Design a protein around this nucleic acid. Structure first.
Ligand SMILES: N[C@@H](Cc1c[nH]c2ccccc12)C(=O)O
Ligand SMILES: [K+]
Ligand SMILES: [K+]
Ligand SMILES: [K+]
Ligand SMILES: [K+]
Ligand SMILES: [K+]
Ligand SMILES: [K+]
Ligand SMILES: [K+]
Ligand SMILES: [K+]
Ligand SMILES: [K+]
Ligand SMILES: [Mg+2]
Ligand SMILES: [Mg+2]
Ligand SMILES: [Mg+2]
Ligand SMILES: [Mg+2]
Ligand SMILES: [Mg+2]
Ligand SMILES: [Mg+2]
Ligand SMILES: [Mg+2]
Ligand SMILES: [Mg+2]
Ligand SMILES: [Mg+2]
Ligand SMILES: [Mg+2]
Ligand SMILES: [Mg+2]
Ligand SMILES: [Mg+2]
Ligand SMILES: [Mg+2]
Ligand SMILES: [Mg+2]
Ligand SMILES: [Mg+2]
Ligand SMILES: [Mg+2]
Ligand SMILES: [Mg+2]
Ligand SMILES: [Mg+2]
Ligand SMILES: [Mg+2]
Ligand SMILES: [Mg+2]
Ligand SMILES: [Mg+2]
Ligand SMILES: [Mg+2]
Ligand SMILES: [Mg+2]
Ligand SMILES: [Mg+2]
Ligand SMILES: [Mg+2]
Ligand SMILES: [Mg+2]
Lengths: 110, 150, 142, 117, 17, 56
RNA sequence: ACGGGGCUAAACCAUGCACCGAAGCUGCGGCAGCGACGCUUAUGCGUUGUUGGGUAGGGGAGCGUUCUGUAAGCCUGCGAAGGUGUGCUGUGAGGCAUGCUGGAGGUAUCAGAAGUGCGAAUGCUGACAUAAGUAACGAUAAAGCGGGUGAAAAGCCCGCU
RNA sequence: CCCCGGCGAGGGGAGUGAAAAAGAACCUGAAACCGUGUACGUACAAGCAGUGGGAGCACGCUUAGGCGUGUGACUGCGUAC
């Protein structure tokens, strides 16, 4: 059994969130939850909510058991950007890109 | 093209390719380089070359036996049902009817049939003869076209 | 049919021992390089090391003709600016007897990761004895 | 009649990018860099169809030179002796015998030493 | 624009007469 | 100063080989409460090494 | 200031015979141009001789794109165009068949007309990279703690300094 | 309608529909660009990154055999448009 949880349009760039997701790839959800609780990164809060939500989709929808779930597959994708303007000196202006993400977690009991 | 003749930026100093108009064809929304005007495509064909090519067409229809000659062709009422039956007896699907004078009823009978054209000897043209599969000429129409090509 | 190519994992290599007393430096080093590379075998392949292992004894008794004994100079540069150092043939035989033969054989081998693998099959000693009695080297009058 | 370049341009760009498979970096991804790479690789293939006939002969020579010297004769004297004995065997074949039939390559050398005598 | 004041300053720009 | 050529996507990923985060090796378990915490830190309700230090 | 190692010949002079060495020449297979001559062409074939590096440039012969007729025909919800793989095929531009996606159009042959082919123009428009998770976060007037709310409080509210 | 979440954003089911990877950012959905997984290579090795030769490995196919596909240690030649 495989179960998905996504967070589309998460508000942080993919490179920052990929640092956190690489900590929990392949771990059991028990170890994954307490690793995410003691890293001081904003992306760890985002990733932890998608993980706790995938776990919940497993019992309600799929009827799995938490004791033997593993984080089989996790990845982050680049999302759309919101383009802004940053006025610079001597009349020039720049282009700020506020980058977003798509966080996908997949838990499997096997 | 609707726009202004203003130069978008000055000639030197900008670091951009030289531009002189927002309506040039290089730009998006600019003019077409060799834009079209309305045209007349009609050609000249000599009178003798035109008439010499109807004779080739006519003598070639006879060779491939697509020219059928009769003496009377008419329908008694302007009804597409009648002309349809008459053509089935002669075993004709699509056909160009050439008659000496345009019958008032044969014209109104044939114009709902898309595979049938009724025409006068004065108005036969090269593309009609080649196009249709069979040509039917009444006898009074053969002598009218023979003199016209002389 | 394609040409035969020697395969790196089935080549046969052998051990030889050479005495270098009274041999001319360069006229010995060419026979070493010839067999280190494998040119004496019908199975020679350019991209395979098909040579043999060679032990050179008495490296400090090799000979040069003419005035090369005191006039042959070995230059090298240390990398730091002004670091050009030289030694004559006299001085290197005194200090590094084995280095003299290895410099000569090394310039005569191909350059690249395979020519550096051929150079590892040359064992050079300044004395008369060697520790490779287990390899059972044959004698070569080369 | 306005004609759009969309379908046709894509086919012709995808043809060059298909021959550039295995190339490092932008040379297998970007059309501009991959077009030059495919052209330069066709010049090498043409030039190296001539060198394949030289690199292989140069290798056959050197295996005959090595097998002949085990029978006490050099290459130049062994090749001369076979012309004097009217033997028309190929260098591609002679180098083959030198590896697989060492007793038949010997018999050739007696034949060449005899005529050379 | 055009500046980049050091592309207008002619001590910096007009250096080789 | 500015680059003369565009650095590739391998030079970018090699530079980031040192950018990874390290997970906390272990969490200590409280003597009485039985709950995990960072070592040398009070737990989430004020137990530290058995006794309750923050009665809040 | 031999390409290097090295060389007292592996240097130089003289003689000689071998061999190596090119996309030169020969062997074998194939294609095309131009002549000469003939099974007699019918515009082609056969024999033969010969030629076949190319910028500016001149001459010849073609591929594919959109549109008009042939076509109220022909293919297509038993899967069209488009997209993405695979195989075969032609000297080339290319063609053909088919797996998956797609979900309604396409169009032989032979003629006709061109907004008919793009890597460059500091080309134009849109998207997306690089530097790089780097500089910076806008006056060096300054904060500290307790309580409250709240999913969460350095910054909000209340209080004392 | 249910479930995680902050009475969120976002998602997983259920249901509608021929189709929901038609879900409102909605026909088709290319390329650049960015990722996850698997096979092979890569930490003594110098340069337009290919080309000719070529071992080994991995997966298929069929054999009383080496073929196909992917990778490419080592090696001759090679200074983009
Ligand atoms: N260098 C100064 C003065 C300056 C403004 N514009 C200039 C043009 C040219 C030379 C100097 C200047 C500045 O940037 O404020
Ligand atoms: K205007
Ligand atoms: K009508
Ligand atoms: K299709
Ligand atoms: K451009
Ligand atoms: K970056
Ligand atoms: K500041
Ligand atoms: K679909
Ligand atoms: K894509
Ligand atoms: K190579
Ligand atoms: Mg500023
Ligand atoms: Mg201002
Ligand atoms: Mg400039
Ligand atoms: Mg317009
Ligand atoms: Mg007139
Ligand atoms: Mg030289
Ligand atoms: Mg010869
Ligand atoms: Mg040759
Ligand atoms: Mg030739
Ligand atoms: Mg020519
Ligand atoms: Mg049409
Ligand atoms: Mg089409
Ligand atoms: Mg055009
Ligand atoms: Mg160009
Ligand atoms: Mg855009
Ligand atoms: Mg930028
Ligand atoms: Mg830096
Ligand atoms: Mg810094
Ligand atoms: Mg800073
Ligand atoms: Mg401030
Ligand atoms: Mg406070
Ligand atoms: Mg449903
Ligand atoms: Mg539709
Ligand atoms: Mg879509
Ligand atoms: Mg290594
Ligand atoms: Mg080393």
């Amino acid at each position: 059994m495989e179960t998905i949880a996504k967070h589309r349009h998460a508000r942080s760039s993919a490179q920052k969130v990929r640092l956190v997701a690489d900590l929990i790839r392949g771990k059991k959800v028990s170890q994954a939850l307490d690793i995410l609780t003691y890293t001081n990164k904003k992306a760890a809060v985002l990733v932890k909510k998608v993980l706790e939500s995938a776990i919940a989709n497993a019992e309600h929808n799929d009827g799995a058991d938490i004791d033997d779930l593993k984080v089989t597959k996790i990845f982050v994708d680049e999302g759309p950007s919101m383009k802004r303007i940053m006025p610079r000196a001597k009349g020039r202006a720049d282009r700020i890109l506020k980058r977003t993400s798509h966080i996908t977690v997949v838990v499997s009991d096997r | 093209v609707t726009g202004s003749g203003k130069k978008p930026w000055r000639q030197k100093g900008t670091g951009r390719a030289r531009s002189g108009s927002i309506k040039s064809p290089i730009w998006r929304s600019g003019g077409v380089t060799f834009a079209a005007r309305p045209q007349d495509h009609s050609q000249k064909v000599n009178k003798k070359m035109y008439r010499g090519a109807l004779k080739s067409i006519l003598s070639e229809l006879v060779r491939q036996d697509r020219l059928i000659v009769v003496e009377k062709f008419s329908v008694e009422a302007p009804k597409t049902k009648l002309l349809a039956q008459k053509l089935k007896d002669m075993a004709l699907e699509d056909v160009l009817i050439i008659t000496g004078e345009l019958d008032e009823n044969l014209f109104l009978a044939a114009r709902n049939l898309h595979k049938v054209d009724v025409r006068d000897a004065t108005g036969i043209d090269p593309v009609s003869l080649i196009a249709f599969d069979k040509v039917v000429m009444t006898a009074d129409a053969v002598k009218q076209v023979e003199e016209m090509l002389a | 049919m394609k040409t035969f190519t020697a395969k790196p994992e089935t080549v046969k290599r052998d051990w030889y021992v050479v005495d270098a007393t009274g041999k001319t430096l360069g006229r010995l080093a060419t026979e070493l390089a010839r067999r280190l590379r494998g040119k004496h075998k019908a199975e020679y392949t350019p991209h395979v090391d098909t040579g043999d292992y060679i032990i050179v004894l008495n490296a400090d008794k090799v000979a040069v003709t003419g005035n090369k004994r005191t006039d042959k100079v070995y230059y090298h540069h240390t990398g730091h600016i002004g670091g050009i150092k030289q030694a004559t043939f006299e001085e290197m035989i005194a200090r590094r007897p084995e280095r003299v033969i290895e410099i000569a054989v090394k310039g005569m081998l191909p350059k690249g990761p395979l020519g550096r693998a051929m150079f590892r099959k040359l064992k050079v000693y300044a004395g008369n004895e060697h520790n490779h009695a287990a390899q059972q080297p044959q004698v070569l009058d080369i | 009649a306005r004609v759009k370049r969309g379908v046709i341009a894509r086919a012709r760009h995808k043809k060059i990018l298909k021959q550039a498979k295995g190339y490092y970096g932008a040379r297998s991804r970007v059309y501009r860099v991959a077009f030059q790479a495919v052209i330069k690789a066709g010049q090498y293939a043409y030039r190296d169809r001539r060198q394949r006939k030289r690199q292989f002969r140069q290798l056959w020579i050197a295996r005959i030179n090595a097998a002949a010297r085990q029978n006490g004769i050099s290459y130049s004297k062994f090749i001369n002796g076979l012309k004097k004995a009217s033997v028309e065997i190929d260098r591609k074949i002679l180098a083959d015998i030198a590896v697989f039939d060492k007793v038949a390559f010997t018999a050739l050398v007696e034949k060449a030493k005899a005529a050379l005598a | 624009v055009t500046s980049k004041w050091f592309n207008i300053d002619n001590k910096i720009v007009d250096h080789f007469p | 100063a500015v680059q003369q050529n565009k650095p590739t996507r391998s030079k970018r990923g090699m530079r980031r080989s040192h950018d990874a985060l390290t997970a906390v090796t272990s969490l200590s378990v409280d003597k009485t409460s039985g709950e995990k915490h960072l070592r040398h830190h009070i737990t989430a309700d004020g137990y530290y090494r058995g006794r309750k230090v923050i009665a809040k």
